[PDB]
Write a protein that binds this ligand. Structure first.
Ligand SMILES: CCCCCC(=O)SCCNC(=O)CCNC(=O)[C@H](O)C(C)(C)COP(=O)(O)OP(=O)(O)OC[C@H]1O[C@@H](n2cnc3c(N)ncnc32)[C@H](O)[C@@H]1OP(=O)(O)O
Ligand SMILES: CCCCCC(=O)SCCNC(=O)CCNC(=O)[C@H](O)C(C)(C)COP(=O)(O)OP(=O)(O)OC[C@H]1O[C@@H](n2cnc3c(N)ncnc32)[C@H](O)[C@@H]1OP(=O)(O)O
Ligand SMILES: NC(=O)c1ccc[n+]([C@@H]2O[C@H](COP(=O)([O-])OP(=O)(O)OC[C@H]3O[C@@H](n4cnc5c(N)ncnc54)[C@H](O)[C@@H]3O)[C@@H](O)[C@H]2O)c1
Ligand SMILES: NC(=O)c1ccc[n+]([C@@H]2O[C@H](COP(=O)([O-])OP(=O)(O)OC[C@H]3O[C@@H](n4cnc5c(N)ncnc54)[C@H](O)[C@@H]3O)[C@@H](O)[C@H]2O)c1
Lengths: 416, 416
């Protein structure tokens, strides 16, 4: 069992390595073909780049034989870095309990199969609101993300698309064109690569980070063709300083806030001081809350808005030595779920990305060299992978995706 | 880092190895003291058998310093096989978004700390409906379970108690006294130990299993002082045969159905025949659905009823070689969540238990000897541990606990 060269995004290459087959039965197979004829290579015999099963048709548990009939033949013929996606209906919203039971069981299918795919290929489960108009324009951003090299490190996860219709962006290849994005913690690591990706996709980045970071930040802003605001997100006046920086540079409006800045102060709870607790709570939790309410509250972010939070696998599964940190990363899941209704009223989505083992950076190089393999893809991921998920949510056309938590972990063995 | 001798249940011993401290602030600290003065050794300096933090008081994220102030002193003083429990308010039902954010973040705290406790001790998070009457009689079955040797292999999990009031059973030491319990798959393994535990707690067991099992089943029925019904739960007439067996033996009524019978037919989806798919779907999924609707539908199980399903970690995290099996075990989570409302209307709860690495039985004795350690408690569990969780749900006084999925896994590293 050997790790694949994961194909990542590169401009001009086709989204998939092969052709796209779209089986199954229900309200999605048809309109999905129609929406993806243009940019994909539809079947139809020869190396598959992506299998997609419409599951919405399955209305009772006996129906689940369907996955077997569609998948078992085609699997041996799945490409390098191919993409399996099962599209179902939101289980809570089904028309009968029988249907709810069947759609729920799919998660068990998609996650088990993710652990069988070979040569870097991945599975995904996507639920779609049964209130979605038949075109399902609300579903395109998610399918376009999953069926591409962009999702390289996203594996085994569950996306949940709502009812609202979506406008496609002017150019799918540059989706954040003309958007203004605030990135906290942009001097280095994942935060900087978010700036890059956001820039790549056409956005103007406000790159925020502390005085200490000094110039690492300017290097990042110059690199992405953005601006640099040297600010401690925990400062009593962070909201003022940002709204003001926006007033100068972008007429007082911003489209995307990425709450990426974070710290750790790992200690066992037993030997844990107030400063290790309080310092972590302040950056990772209070500030993202305060910044999001702040910025929406004064009109800096309005209709069409996007808030994305950085959660973590620790927030989901816990981790030894991180009761503080994990509280914050679960807290961030808390922000995403609690504010989703309010913000939806205001035309704003909010979603979270939960990284697993990312290389730049991750601790004894005795546990490093192991924890990096403990996932279906057998390798550690890269900042760009996490940034791509984040760019997906930021998309002008991801307006029907809110309240989601997606791990970017290559289906890491660990979880709740 | 070395595995503890887990203290399991034994009649007459005290529920805890030490004294019970109940800190924190909110609507639960007081009434909880009152309800547990009688059977527990309340503080108050010397070896703690159980720490319990009332979290319901925490209404904004800055509040979360509370866990730190209560836990950091007391932790070094935690007994052998001690029990940490944080009791919070259902996050969805909070009065403000701020409170929802704080109560949500607790999960991250309880799971991270579970990975730090020493010498077999465990954490649990329990949410309580803010509609619960101040006495919180609905919460006693859960606290009594967690704070005992009975929960020996339950670690890091999340329980969710509703609003309804509860009557205590006549004798807490024999909670299923006079109840009639149907156990499927009782000839051996976990199913038989459920019969034992159910018998121990005063119940009359109908022990069901196939013809093949022949006598293993009679040995179990004679052992528990029950009756033996030799029946393939997938048979077109399983519901008739059981209602009829009940008509003879228990005046046509049963109080508890345990949907424990299951099989595997592990194969990779790629090389998977119809019979490995269909055979597994039929026992593990269609039959538990058909049996529960069947038995409630003809009045065999009525008000005061209890349905408990056997799910699995595979159903939650997936597993290689088990797309069929995991579909069923996720399916079983599907049954528990889909039927909870309907059945609640009828005075019936339904809940699921998801075992992890249980010894009798679990595959190469090269992966056995590893997978058994991959959990906070560093050892594989035992059938009795799984049966105890199940007996907890069956309790006459667990009427405010429905729709729950609890893993019995000693906080196994693997999950979603
Ligand atoms: C923005 C950047 C974020 C992204 C980067 C990441 O997230 S990467 C970060 C990943 N980090 C992790 O996964 C956490 C890994 N870290 C660790 O395990 C931790 O460093 C550690 C537990 C070893 C350190 O904890 P501490 O310093 O509190 O405690 P320490 O190891 O010194 O304990 C020894 C003494 O404390 C007492 N003690 C009390 N309880 C004890 C216990 N349960 N186990 C051992 N010792 C204990 C004993 O009396 C003993 O003497
Ligand atoms: C009631 C009792 C239930 C409670 C008990 C439990 O749950 S305990 C059960 C726990 N079981 C598990 O955790 C699952 C562990 N089992 C396994 O891993 C499985 O036995 C297995 C994958 C090795 C067997 O799968 P198969 O028989 O379908 O396939 P096999 O290993 O022979 O594959 C070899 C051939 O198939 C093809 N092939 C196709 N895809 C392949 C792939 N992804 N990886 C390797 N081979 C592949 C190749 O051409 C190759 O030649
Ligand atoms: N594998 C890991 O990197 C991993 C895993 C899970 C989650 N995450 C999360 O993803 C995010 C990125 O982590 P990273 O690996 O790039 O670490 P990093 O430490 O390299 O990057 C964080 C940046 O945030 C900045 N920052 C810290 N406090 C700040 C403050 N108060 N105000 C403004 N800026 C501040 C730091 O200067 C730093 O430049 C974090 O939120 C982290 O918690 C990381
Ligand atoms: N560690 C593991 O044991 C583990 C892990 C997770 C979940 N589970 C689940 O817990 C339950 C118990 O498993 P077990 O380890 O005791 O395995 P087991 O095979 O020893 O016990 C199952 C019993 O069910 C009986 N049975 C099978 N099909 C039946 C049918 N159609 N009708 C009536 N009886 C039938 C079998 O005869 C057997 O006696 C199963 O549902 C299993 O899926 C087990």
């Amino acid at each position: 069992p050997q790790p694949e060269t994961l194909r990542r995004y590169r401009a001009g290459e086709p989204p998939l390595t092969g052709s796209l087959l779209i089986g199954g039965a229900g309200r999605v197979v048809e309109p999905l073909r129609a929406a993806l004829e243009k940019d994909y290579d539809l079947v139809g015999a020869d190396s598959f780049g992506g299998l997609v099963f419409d599951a919405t048709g399955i209305t009772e548990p006996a129906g689940l034989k369907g996955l077997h009939e569609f998948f078992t033949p085609v699997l041996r013929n799945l490409g390098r870095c191919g993409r399996v996606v099962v599209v179902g209906g939101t289980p809570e919203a089904a028309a009968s309990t029988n249907e709810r039971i069947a759609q729920r069981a799919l998660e068990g299918f998609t996650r088990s199969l993710g652990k069988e795919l070979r040569r870097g290929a991945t599975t995904a489960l996507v639920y779609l609101s049964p209130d979605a108009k038949p075109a399902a324009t609300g579903l395109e951003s998610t399918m376009r993300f999953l069926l591409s090299a962009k999702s390289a490190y996203v594996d085994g996860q569950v996306f949940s698309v709502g009812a609202d219709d979506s406008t496609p962006p002017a150019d799918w290849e540059k989706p954040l064109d003309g958007k203004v994005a605030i990135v906290t913690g942009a001097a280095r690591g994942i935060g900087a690569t978010i700036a890059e990706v956001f820039a790549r996709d056409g956005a103007h980045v406000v790159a925020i980070d502390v005085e200490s970071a000094a110039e690492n930040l300017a290097e990042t802003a110059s690199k992405v063709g953005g601006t640099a605001l040297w600010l401690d997100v925990t400062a009593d006046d962070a909201v003022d300083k940002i709204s003001e920086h926006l007033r100068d540079h972008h007429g007082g409006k911003a489209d995307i806030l990425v709450n990426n800045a974070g710290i750790t102060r790992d200690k066992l709870l037993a030997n844990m001081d107030d400063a290790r607790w309080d310092a972590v709570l302040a950056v990772n939790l209070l500030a993202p809350l305060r910044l999001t309410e702040g910025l929406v509250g004064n009109g800096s972010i309005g209709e069409g808005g996007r808030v994305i939070g950085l959660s973590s696998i620790a927030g989901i599964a816990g981790n030894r030595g991180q009761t503080n940190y994990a509280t914050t990363k679960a807290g961030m899941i808390g922000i995403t779920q609690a504010l989703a209704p309010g913000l939806a009223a205001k035309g704003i989505t909010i979603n979270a990305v939960a990284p697993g083992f990312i290389e730049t950076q991750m601790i004894p190089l005795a546990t490093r060299e192991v924890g990096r393999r403990l996932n279906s893809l057998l390798q550690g991921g890269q900042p760009v992978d996490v940034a791509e998920a984040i760019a997906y949510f930021a998309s002008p056309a991801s307006n029907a995706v809110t309240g989601n938590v997606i791990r970017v972990c290559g289906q890491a063995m660990i979880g709740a």
